[PDB]
Amino acid sequence: ARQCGQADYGWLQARYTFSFGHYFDPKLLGYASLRVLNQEVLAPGAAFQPRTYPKVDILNVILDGEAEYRDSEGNHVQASAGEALLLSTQPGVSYSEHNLSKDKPLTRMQLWLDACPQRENPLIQKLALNMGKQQLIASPEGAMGSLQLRQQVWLHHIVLDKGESANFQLHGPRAYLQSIHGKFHALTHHEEKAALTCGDGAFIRDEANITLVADSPLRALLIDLPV
C-alpha cells in the first residue's frame, strides 16, 4: 500500500525484507551472495534485541534518523541519515541496533553478504554518501574511498532526477538492482532489460554493462555480484 511513482511519498515508512539464496558455479568457487535486503523502521525510543548473525557481513544505509550499533565485545558506532555502515561480523558475537531519538523514528536499509570469517577486514567502517549521480560505496579494496568489503562485490548508490541516466561496467556475472525510492529501468546493449517500480528489486545476469534510467526522482543501489 505504498503509492508511487513520482513522489513515492511514504518511502521512508516502507518496511520489507527480501531473503535470497546462495549461488554456486563450478567455474567460480567460494564466492558470496546477497542474502538479505531489508528496509526497517524503528519507532522513537525503540531498539531491536541483540542477535548473532549467520556468517554474513551487514551493511546499513541510514535513510532517516540516527542509530547506535553495539556488539558484545564493547565495539560501538553511531550512524545518521546519509551514512553507510559496514559491520564485518564475528562468530558468536551479539549485535544490537538502537534508535538514538526519543522523539523521532529511524529508517534504514540493510544488506547481508555471505562472509568468509577468516578473511581480515576492519570490524566497523562508515562512509558519508555524497548523493551524486553515482558513487561506489563499497568494493573489495575500498577503491575511490569506498567501504572495504571482504567479498568480491562492488556496491553503487545512485541518485538521479527523472530522465537522467548512469552507466555501470560490471566485474561479476550477476547484478542486483534495488529501488530505494522512485522507479527506473535498466538497459543493456541499448535495449530495455528490466523496469522497476518503487521498492522493486531485480537480479540481472551476464551483462557486462548496464545503464540505469530514472523514470521519476530516484535513489537506487546497483550491486555487482561475483557468482
Which residues in this chain contact Cl ion in the complex, by CB under 5 A? 31-32, 151-152, 204-205, 226
Cell output for 16: 520489507
Q: Which is nearer to Cl ion, 107 or 178 (CB)?
A: 178
Q: Which is nearer to Cl ion, 82 or 172 (CB)?
A: 172
Q: What is d(CA 23, CA 100) in angstroms, rounded to the nearest whole number?
A: 37
Shortest distance in whole angstroms from residue 218 CB to Cl ion: 21
Encode burial over 33-53: b for 16+ CB neighbours within 10 A, e otherwise: bbbebebbbbeeeebeeeeeb
Facing residues of 51 across strands? 95
Q: Which is nearer to Cl ion, 32 or 180 (CB)?
A: 32
Sign of the dihedral defined by the CA atoms of residues 120, 95, 128, 13, in that order: positive
Shortest distance in whole angstroms from residue 152 CB to Cl ion: 4
Helix (H/G/I), strand (E/B), else coil: 97: strand
Q: Which is nearer to Cl ion, 4 or 177 (CB)?
A: 177
Q: What is d(CA 63, CA 84) in angstroms, rounded to the nearest whole number?
A: 9
Q: Which is nearer to Cl ion, 27 or 205 (CB)?
A: 205
Shortest distance in whole angstroms from residue 179 CB to Cl ion: 17
The pair phi, psi for residue 143, each rounded to 5°, is: -55, 145
First-to-last C-alpha distance (Å) of the chain: 34
Shortest distance in whole angstroms from residue 119 CB to Cl ion: 9
Shortest distance in whole angstroms from residue 31 CB to Cl ion: 4
Shortest distance in whole angstroms from residue 117 CB to Cl ion: 13
Instruction: Report the relative pairing of strands 56-64 and 165-169 from DSSP bridges.
Output: unpaired
Q: What is d(CA 63, CA 61) in angstroms, rounded to the nearest whole number?
A: 6
Q: Which is nearer to Cl ion, 5 or 226 (CB)?
A: 226
